[PDB]
């Protein structure tokens, strides 16, 4: 069971700075006098860390459910042993496996099951009147659990439950990690005499235990113990005390560290590779001592920002006008067949209008039609009454669907239908439109018939004359101006798209973004995906060329198709980060040198030099740079660059 707290005045969390903290043994191996670099999750040096308060003198009780990232750092400068344990989980509602570490006064157990936590688990400490000792009775951390698969009891660590307000005398650090479902705990007790601003000392954290757990962890909470003496009434509403305590919480991120080992196989110092250029120079040379001279650590490369596309001027269009604006329409049994190819497809006016009645596109989705490029486009056209419009779709059967026009079951095209009653019928009605009622068998899809032979239905032939048991399959339509809506004539145009081995001849429209210049951008001018700047050239092009190369056979000149401008292609920038070092036991600052990148800061002939001040006078030089300019450490005193004296 648990109880809820009341709203009171708290203190906002503050931020402090770490000083060479969060270093542990990354493996279970022995290294003696070895400078070994490994990729593992540590705490970066001089990084922002989260700080919480736990001292009563007011009433600061802040234990939020902080998220669990990849590896955490937990440092506590505990003196009176107020901290008890830690809990972990994801949703904290008895739905997933969740972890419970409580270091109790008798023994340490590690149970991980679906316990039912409250909004703030805590341990209650009471002061007995007859017994002058502190004991813990309020076991309120959860309600109950259903089932689990793992449990572990640790060594019986002895605890003091007396709380005081004095200065801290011990410092405890804890590191919790979870790779591949394995739980890691790293800890080491280091006595110190300090209250705030943790010292710059170094202390590697030895592994403690390696419980295999195999669950997901994303949230965690901190457990604190309060005291109930005779001064407080004893109710957990507004009056309580907790002594003096403080804890720190940090988050680990993957970094590359070079670790120093002694003859005893213990870690002494650590140097980063992505924190300081001096640290990078130290860790690249695999040595803790750097002499004077030039050094190369890594490279420098600029990345593209935008991505511009300028297709050529689209003036090509498909003959979709007269195939829809046709004065005369053929019969259903003699439907027209028109092939459309070698043109840029334009369906925008096809779907932007709404005079049509049917826009059902089988096989392919009409929402993406400008992006699809096809080889052949076919368009049929016939007139059918409003009742026999659903028979056009494949699968359905009927007189029109099986005797005049049949579509395949794997159609990947579109059907366009609209109503035109006044145009297709006068006051007297139309009688020039024919259709088939009878046929020997069914019709295979995409097959039309022109023969108008008398159909016989019986067994006795009629000798090719009009009579009984044989009639005319071809018959006319009767149309009226005042007929029903379903009897009104409708014009149906069917679009068919197919793919063959020939190159695609129909394509959608092409967009064109605005052109920016003098910037490291990416462009695709129909023949290459080139990234670079686009400067203004002074060389004209013959009026038939779109590409352009150089002596080294590299595409470095492409003409803008819409404005007929000649633009050059140039890589943005690349190079390395060279560093000049005064040497060991002489200085600590370095200067960054670029070989050919063009930009305290001095613009030298041999690239860009920063961190070194140029002087006009010339002395003898010791550290070579190039182009008759060296660097030296001269008078405080800083790194100076000057022309070398012969």
């Amino acid at each position, epitope marked *: 069971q648990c109880v809820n707290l009341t709203t009171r005045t708290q203190l906002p969390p503050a931020y402090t700075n770490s000083f060479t903290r969060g270093v542990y043994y990354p493996d279970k191996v022995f290294r003696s006098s070895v400078l070994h670099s490994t990729q593992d999750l540590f705490l970066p040096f001089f990084s922002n860390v989260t700080w919480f308060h736990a001292i009563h003198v007011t009433k600061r009780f802040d234990n939020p459910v902080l998220p669990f990232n990849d590896g955490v750092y937990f440092a506590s400068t505990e003196k009176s042993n107020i901290i008890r344990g830690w809990i972990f989980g994801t949703t904290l509602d008895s739905k997933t496996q969740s972890l419970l570490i409580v270091n109790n006064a008798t023994n340490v157990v590690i149970k991980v099951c679906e316990f039912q936590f409250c909004n703030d688990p805590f341990l209650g400490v009471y002061y007995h009147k007859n017994n002058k000792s502190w004991m813990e009775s309020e076991f309120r951390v959860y309600s109950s659990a259903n089932n689990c698969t793992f449990e572990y009891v640790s060594q019986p660590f002895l605890m003091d439950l007396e709380g005081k307000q004095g200065n801290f005398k011990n410092l405890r650090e804890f590191v919790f990690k979870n790779i591949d479902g394995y739980f890691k705990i790293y800890s080491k007790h280091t006595p110190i005499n300090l209250v705030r601003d943790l010292p710059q000392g170094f202390s590697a954290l030895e592994p403690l235990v390696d419980l295999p757990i195999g669950i997901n962890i994303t949230r965690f909470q901190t457990l604190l113990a309060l005291h109930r003496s005779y001064l407080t009434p004893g109710d957990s509403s507004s009056g309580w005390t907790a002594g003096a305590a403080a804890y720190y919480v940090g988050y680990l991120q993957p970094r590359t560290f070079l670790l120093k080992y002694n003859e005893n196989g213990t870690i002494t110092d650590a140097v980063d590779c992505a924190l300081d250029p001096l640290s990078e120079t130290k860790c690249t040379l695999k040595s803790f001592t750097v002499e004077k001279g030039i050094y190369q650590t890594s490279n420098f490369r600029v990345q593209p920002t935008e991505s511009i596309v300028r297709f050529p001027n689209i003036t090509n269009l498909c003959p979709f006008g007269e195939v829809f604006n046709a004065t005369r329409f053929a019969s259903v049994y003699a439907w027209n067949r028109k092939r459309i190819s070698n043109c840029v497809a334009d369906y925008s006016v096809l*779907y*932007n*209008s*709404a*005079s049509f*009645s*049917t*826009f*059902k596109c089988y096989g392919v*989705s*009409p*929402t993406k039609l400008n992006d699809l490029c096809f080889t052949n486009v076919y368009a049929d056209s016939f007139v059918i009454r409003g009742d026999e*419009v*659903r028979q056009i*779709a494949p*699968g*359905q059967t009927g007189k029109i669907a099986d005797y005049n026009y049949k579509l395949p079951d794997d159609f990947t095209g579109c059907v366009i239908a609209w*109503n035109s009653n006044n145009l297709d019928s006068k006051v007297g009605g139309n009688y020039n439109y024919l259709y088939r009622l009878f046929r020997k068998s069914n019709l295979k899809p995409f097959e039309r018939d022109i023969s108008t032979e008398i159909y016989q239905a019986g067994s006795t032939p009629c000798n090719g004359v009009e009579g009984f048991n044989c009639y005319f399959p071809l018959q006319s339509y009767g149309f009226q101006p005042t007929n029903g809506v379903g009897y009104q004539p409708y014009r149906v145009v069917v679009l068919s798209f197919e793919l063959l081995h020939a190159p695609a001849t129909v394509c959608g429209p092409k967009k064109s973004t605005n052109l920016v210049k003098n910037k490291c951008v990416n462009f695709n001018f129909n023949g290459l995906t080139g990234t670079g700047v686009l400067t203004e050239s002074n060389k004209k092009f013959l009026p038939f060329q779109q590409f352009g190369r150089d002596i080294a056979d590299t595409t470095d000149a492409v003409r803008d198709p819409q404005t007929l401008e000649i633009l050059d292609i140039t890589p943005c920038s690349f190079g390395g980060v060279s560093v000049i070092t005064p040497g060991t036991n002489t200085s600590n600052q370095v200067a960054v040198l670029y070989q050919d990148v063009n930009c305290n800061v001095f613009q030298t002939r041999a690239g860009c030099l920063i961190g070194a001040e140029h002087v006009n006078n010339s002395y003898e030089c010791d550290i070579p740079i190039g182009a008759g300019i060296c660097a030296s450490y001269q008078t405080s005193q800083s790194i100076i660059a000057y022309t070398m004296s012969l």
Partner: antibody
Amino acid sequence: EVQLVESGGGLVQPGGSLRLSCAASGFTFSSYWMSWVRQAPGKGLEWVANIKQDGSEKYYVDSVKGRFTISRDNAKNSLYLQMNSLRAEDTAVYYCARGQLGPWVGVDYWGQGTLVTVS
Amino acid sequence: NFMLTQPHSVSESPGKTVTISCTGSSGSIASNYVQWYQQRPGSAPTTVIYEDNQRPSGVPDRFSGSIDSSSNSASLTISGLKTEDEADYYCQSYDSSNWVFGGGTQLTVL
């Protein structure tokens, strides 16, 4: 991410004239279909009107035929909805509905809307 | 005079698959596209199923649709039936230069 802002209501009038506006941003206003959709409080959805991207064609439902008008422009990326001869049935919330290709793709775009009551 | 007929209270079931039917009477709904709209009660509506065979980006796959031309009805199926389903559904087709909307199918008890 497309922002739609509507502020055209907030007052009651019997049989008067009302001015509703939908403001849109984050896309090209002159290349997609547009629509207006209203809902009575506690009732189902129903369609009011639609317009083409260039404003050439404007259609309404037969209930509001004869009255009502809709217009658009692409310079300021805004809509104009004007109403006249209101009735007591017009207590509804109004959404400016954005199209993609035409009347077949679907509405798929609804504003937050503005509460419009008459009394 | 096209209308779309659909119920008002269905799918009051925990954690399984239940289908909702939308049908018309004046004409065939399979000629044009029909769409399903999902509306938050008291806020902006949204859209769950469109194109009869598509769903907006970010929409979970639990929702699915189908077309039965024999009964002239459109079926919307929800599989997960999770805690984020408290809405009323609508069915929308197009006849000729006009739009008709469904009556509404309230779903609150999940």
